[PDB]
Amino acid sequence: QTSQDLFSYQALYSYIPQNDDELELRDGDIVDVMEKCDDGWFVGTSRRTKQFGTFPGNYVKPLY
């Protein structure tokens, strides 16, 4: 409302971590950004096993 947090996104497809900082992403997974990187990607926590990994925020889309 006034404060307003960040938002959640639903992933287009599944993603496999290449870096130990990245998140294991599954098709249609929801992500919430832990921190925004000004280079274009965010950190995020997976709805699956509640793990937090970073990956492109333009790789995921608004919740369907």
Only one residue has tokens 């959640």, namely 8
Distance CA 57, CA 2 (A): 24
Map out the domains of the chain as residue ranges: 1-64
Q: What distances in angstroms separate CA 59 from CA 1, 4, 16, 21, 50, one per listed residue?
A: 26, 23, 13, 16, 19
Experimentally, the structure was elucidated by NMR
Beta strands in the chain (DSSP E): 8-11, 30-36, 41-46, 52-56, 60-62
> What's the CATH number of domain 1-64, 2.60.40.1180, 3.40.50.300, 1.10.150.120, 2.30.30.40?
2.30.30.40
